[PDB]
Amino acid sequence: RSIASSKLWMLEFSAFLERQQDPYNKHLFVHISQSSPSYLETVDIRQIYDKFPEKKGGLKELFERGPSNAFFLVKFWADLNTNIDDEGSAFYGVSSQYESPENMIITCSTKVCSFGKQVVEKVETEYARYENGHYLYRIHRSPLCEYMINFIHKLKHLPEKYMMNSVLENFTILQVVTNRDTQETLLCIAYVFEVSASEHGAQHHIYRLVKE
């Protein structure tokens, strides 16, 4: 169940909001963690083809460049059961951590896609930190882009859960983590989304992406 290639493992990923240094007191929208357990191992790109970019540099081309073991699909059920966004003065962020056996400089590109078309991209570079015999990489508290903050505002205030799911059917994120020096794909993660019911927290299911 690890999002791990031969060269890189994403151990943790969370997106959250909190009061601007009012905390502990955060709310997680989505969360993958070693701290948090979770429970069909592959999905073919044909199932998600139109939900991601597919031109030069697109998902299919990236997959064909490989390596095949670097490509994953994560389905998230996002927990929007919070009122912090309505109070204002909130901080919205994303934190991730990775590990490798190798010392690398990595670049994480995150593309937000609407109906399969990129609308915003964030690029972050991180450096290896040796700890207890392996290399750790952290992207800590990266602020969510304004597009996504506004999207969450508008989404959480629709009148029906099913409408939230409809909006989310054509909202995706494509994360590509590359080795900065070689441009090798270390990890490529396609994210698709639904909302959690009010009585449930965030959930996820992880798949390997394949292409028959």
Binding site: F115, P159, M163, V167, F171
Partner: peptide
């Protein structure tokens, strides 16, 4: 824009929600 996304996804329903 976020508004354009919502209008594409929800059709006339979003037009009604946004207006009123």
């Amino acid at each position: 824009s976020v508004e354009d996304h919502f209008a594409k996804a929800l059709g006339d329903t979003w037009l009604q929600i946004k207006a009123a």
